[PDB]
């Protein structure tokens, strides 16, 4: 098989990463001048965290990458025993590198590591820092214990903006000779929601499907994000329109009742424009329906009743 575009066009140098401009600039500076600090990179899915850490490591270490990098992720064993033996030994080992370069321990998806294992890392990080530096990547930074956050440089990545995604997509499009219209790329950006991985996946899917990337071809295969549909449902002014949205855009498209109700909860939580007490009442009603569905009564009537009760509240 040929490489999927997501892997084919994975950046290999820091200058090919879009977004988070100031942080990427700092990383390029570090890669040029060495002395890499301990660092924690955090943010939402598919915005360039793993890519940035690997690019930085490659540029720092050159041909010494094979012996000078220890990578561990969720597919690896990372219990307290591994931290106390394998990582400690790698931190203690001899390795001559050019001045300003250090061995690098990459702990990808570090937010799944247990608290005890994290505790076991503190003094290894402190004692061997003249030869080893640690890079953590995670999605939920609050899952890294405070003593480890204290020893690290904090790099919180923001979601990619429509302009960054558009720029990267245009690069790939020119490289692949893709025919497109502005509405098509705007539809791709709209459905990606700031996840570059999803933007490239849906671009490949549209091109494979229908050749030309216009809005209609995009929406033939790519769904508009159902959280936005649910938000529209929750904000409708009269009960009949909200029920119409539920019926046509969610229930008859095949979305499960449990998916609809959990999305309703998540969206109501974040509806900053509705006063908080109203959202608490709505959450109570949504939770009642959620419990009924989990008992096995996940019918369209239950969701319609949920909508009716929310309407009674917001009135």
């Amino acid at each position: 098989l040929q490489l999927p575009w997501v892997e084919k066009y994975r950046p290999q140098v820091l200058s090919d990463i879009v977004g988070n401009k100031e942080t990427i600039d700092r990383l390029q500076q570090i890669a040029k001048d060495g002395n890499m600090p301990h660092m924690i990179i955090s943010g939402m899915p598919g915005i360039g965290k793993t890519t940035s850490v690997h690019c930085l490591a490659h540029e720092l270490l050159g041909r010494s990458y094979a012996d000078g990098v220890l990578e561990l992720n969720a597919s690896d064993d990372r219990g307290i025993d591994v931290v106390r033996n394998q990582i400690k030994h790698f931190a203690q080992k001899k390795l001559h590198l050019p001045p300003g370069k250090h061995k690098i321990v990459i702990l990808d998806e570090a937010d799944s590591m247990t608290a005890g294992a994290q505790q076991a890392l503190r003094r290894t990080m402190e004692l061997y820092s003249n030869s080893t530096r640690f890079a953590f990547a995670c999605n939920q930074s609050n899952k890294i214990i405070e003593p480890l956050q204290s020893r690290c440089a904090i790099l919180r990545y923001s979601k990619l903006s429509d302009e960054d995604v558009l720029k990267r997509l245009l690069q790939i499009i020119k490289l692949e000779d893709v025919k497109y219209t502005n509405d098509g790329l705007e539809a791709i950006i709209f459905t990606a929601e700031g996840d570059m991985r999803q933007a490239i996946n849906n671009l490949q899917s549209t091109v494979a499907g229908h050749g030309l990337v216009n809005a209609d071809n995009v929406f033939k295969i790519v769904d508009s994000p159902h959280p936005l549909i649910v938000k529209k449902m929750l904000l409708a002014s009269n009960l009949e329109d909200s029920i119409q949205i539920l019926r046509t855009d969610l229930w008859k498209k095949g979305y499960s009742s449990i998916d609809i109700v959990t999305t309703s909860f998540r969206v109501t939580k974040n509806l900053a424009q509705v006063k908080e007490s109203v959202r608490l009442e709505m959450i109570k009603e949504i939770g009642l329906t959620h419990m009924r569905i989990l008992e096995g009564v996940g019918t369209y009537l239950q969701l319609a009743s949920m909508l009716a009760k929310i309407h009674k509240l917001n009135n």
Partner: protein, 497 residues
């Protein structure tokens, strides 16, 4: 060998002597005084304590939040007084077995390294002795079974100075150390205590730091000096001036998002500020639910404990305090139902956010305001423990008396026990030691032991409480009761329960 421009700023600017340590000067002096007089206090079996009261402790326990200078202080004091240092931390295995097979042998042993380091030096008394540093005691997880108890034992039975370090002193697992360690608190240092250091670093590394923003930096990292130095190191890579034009976004990007502990969670959740329009805009519903997830086994219990103890500022117009409390109580009950469903055989963890709202956020939103007293630990845990004990005792009594009665255990408590009290206790009050035989006859009829007698008398409440009545019974009657009971055999209902 290692260039200075290859080192982390936290290493190249580490304090080299106790003077260079910022803040906590009183704590450092406490530690230094404790260690300096350790031999003198040892000569008196640690039975005489001076003005500071430090002469009766063989061990010292330092505590405080991250990156404020605890490890630095311990190592520097040990070096200044000329001791050899033996260190263990959370990267070591500190179980009871390993502790007993390892560091134990050094509690009363000279150091060979210390001997050979200062063999030439004349009159170096401390060079051959150890200071044992046990860093990161709070980090001892399941890989260190029995470790904390063994360390407390050492704190009582060590012949060489021992310093322990932890971040969370008030944790339950740290209780054993309470009476056997000299507690030294380290607090967050103030911006003034570190302004000179930060400005010196700015001069050395050639970037412009405006002193006026340093306070904000200090607030950004919550007094974490290691973190502030890390921040300066990282920011100065491309930004050579930290001032009022960039401090806001730097502070936002590097802000300490630390989980809170249970009493703190309860305090913040019941604060009325976060439930107002502006407060809700600033501290969002998602943030409140995250508070629930900081400690999701105690937060519902803490809220249920303390939601009656406020003066509320969020009351709706015409809604009295009691009506708001009733709404909160109703929501707490619903939350309990959800909680039951979560921990059933279904394992419905997807309801956890709902529970957070029903058990903690919604009732708090109903009664939030100011606290009319201190935040209290939940009483439900202890009351549940007590109830479990008494139900165990009731089961035992029930199956001793089963062959004679006709009832379930609940009927035994509600109906039978009040009459057993009149057949088993009141005759003592009305007849002294003449009732011994009759009481023994009843006990034999119902296969009851002396232990059952005590248990039964424990059960009564209200005007029928027995503790003071039995305390009043003359010791002659109790001794005669026990002697006559132990003088004979007694039938048994269930051998080897």
């Amino acid at each position: 060998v290692v260039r200075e421009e290859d080192k982390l700023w936290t290493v190249k600017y580490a304090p080299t002597n106790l003077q260079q340590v910022c803040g906590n000067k009183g704590s450092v002096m406490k530690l230094k005084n404790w260690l300096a007089n350790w031999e003198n206090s040892k000569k008196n079996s640690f039975k005489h304590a001076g003005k500071d009261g430090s002469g009766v402790f063989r061990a010292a326990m330092l505590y405080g939040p991250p990156g404020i200078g605890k490890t630095t202080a311990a190592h520097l004091v040990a070096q200044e007084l000329g001791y050899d240092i033996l260190e263990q931390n959370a990267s070591d295995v500190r179980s009871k077995t390993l502790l007993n097979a390892g560091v134990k042998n050094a509690l009363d042993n000279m150091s060979v390294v210390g001997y050979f380091k200062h063999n030439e030096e004349a009159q170096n008394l401390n060079g051959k002795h150890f200071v044992i540093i046990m860093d990161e005691v709070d980090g001892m997880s399941g890989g260190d079974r029995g470790g904390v108890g063994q360390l407390a034992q050492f704190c009582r039975k060590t012949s060489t100075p021992l310093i322990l370090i932890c971040n969370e002193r008030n944790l339950p697992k740290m209780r054993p150390f309470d009476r056997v360690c000299l507690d030294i608190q380290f607090r967050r240092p103030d911006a003034n205590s570190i302004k000179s250091r930060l400005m010196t670093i700015a001069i050395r590394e050639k970037f412009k730091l405006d002193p006026n923003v340093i306070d904000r930096l200090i607030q950004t990292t919550r007094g974490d000096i290691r973190q502030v130095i890390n921040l300066l190191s990282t920011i100065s890579t491309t930004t050579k001036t930290i001032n009022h034009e960039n401090i806001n976004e730097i502070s936002k990007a590097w802000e300490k998002n630390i989980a809170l502990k249970p009493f703190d969670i309860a305090h913040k959740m019941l604060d009325g500020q976060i439930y107002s329009d502006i407060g809700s805009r600033n501290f969002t519903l998602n943030d409140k639910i995250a508070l629930y997830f900081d400690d999701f086994d105690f937060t519902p219990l803490m809220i249920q404990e303390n939601y009656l103890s406020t003066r509320p500022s969020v009351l709706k117009p015409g809604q009295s305090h009691l009506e708001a409390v009733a709404e909160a109580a109703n929501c707490i009950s619903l939350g309990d139902i959800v909680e039951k469903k979560i921990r059933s055989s279904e394992q419905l963890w997807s309801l956890l956010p709902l529970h957070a709202v029903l058990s903690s956020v919604y009732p708090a939103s109903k009664v939030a305001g100011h606290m009319a007293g201190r935040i209290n630990f939940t009483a439900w845990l202890g009351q549940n423990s007590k109830s479990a004990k008494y139900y165990r005792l009731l089961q035992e009594i029930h199956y001793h008396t089963r062959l004679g009665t006709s009832t379930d255990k609940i009927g035994l408590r509600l109906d039978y026990l009040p009459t057993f009290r009149k057949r088993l206790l009141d005759p003592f009050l009305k007849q002294g030691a003449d009732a011994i035989s009759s009481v023994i006859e009843v006990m034999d009829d119902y296969y009851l032991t002396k232990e059952d007698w005590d248990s039964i008398m424990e059960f009564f409440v209200g005007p029928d409480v027995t503790t003071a009545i039995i305390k009043k019974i003359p010791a002659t009657v109790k001794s005669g009761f026990t002697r006559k009971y132990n003088s004979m055999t007694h039938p048994v209902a269930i051998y080897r329960t």
